Amino acid sequence: NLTSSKFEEFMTRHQVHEKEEFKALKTLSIFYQAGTSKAGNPIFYYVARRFKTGQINGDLLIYHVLLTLKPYYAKPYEIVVDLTHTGPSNRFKTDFLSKWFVVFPGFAYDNVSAVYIYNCNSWVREYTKYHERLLTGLKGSKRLVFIDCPGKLAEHIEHEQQKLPAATLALEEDLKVFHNALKLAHKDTKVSIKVGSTAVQVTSAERTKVLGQSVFLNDIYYASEIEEICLVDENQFTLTIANQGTPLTFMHQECEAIVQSIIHIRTRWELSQPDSIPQHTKIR
Secondary structure (H helix, E strand, O other), X not given: OOOHHHHHHHHHHOOOOOOOOHHHHHHHOXXXXXXXXXXXXXXXXXXXXXXXXXXOOHHHHHHXXXXXXXXXXXXXXXXXXXXOOOOXXXXXXXXXXXXXXXHOOOHHHHOEEEEEEEOOOHHHHHXXXXXXXXXXXXXXXXXXXXXXXXXXXXXXXXXXXXXXXXXXXXXXXXXXXXXXXXXXXXXXXXXXXXXXXXXXXXXXXXXXXXXXEEEOOEEEEEOOOOOOOEOOXXXXXXXXXXXXXXXXXXXXXXXXXXXXXXXXXXXXXXXXXXXXXXXOOOOO
């Protein structure tokens, strides 16, 4: 016995406004409205990074999102979702996911002008496969438009109005490209590796099918998270990362050239961090 009217009344009766945990969401800048688009519809930006699985009550997040969309969701609107550096830590459970379909009044769903997805990664694709049933409605969705490369979104969105996260742009994908690196694994897929200043971004060069739309996956690994860096051979190198099980092996004609930078990147962070002596504390 739950509906949009019921949910709104309950939360309104609850004093969520002064909880001081609702206020924190404003600082985190999750689902903030950003200017307009080519059609003139307002734009909103949802940041996947900013949400932890359990540290905060999940209903307050919905109320904040609903509150912001209430004034404008009557008219058609465009929403862009940033899934950069998505991880299992920031996720929606099966039960909590379902509420999104029902809590909103329902007529706003029809006012979804267009959807933009940026900096998707394989983990997100894996999540969709597991939760396919609930998302079957969005299967082959016309409103879903995937930003395969950065050079496309700026065209469709009003440039100088888009306000994507500064940290995302800070990476800028502005470092050397080791084109035609091959990801040796059960199956081999061409991966383009950029050794960024503070992180390493692996951009696949082969399109993949997610919800019936082709897109290129771009996994991002922060330099701080690079615990293990082993160069087994100049033909291929080994990159094990925290709680990732089997390491990632790739083939490049000059592995030490890439690994040299990775060691250079990691070594710089070691100086940046205050204390590397505290470590471990967990035996898997």
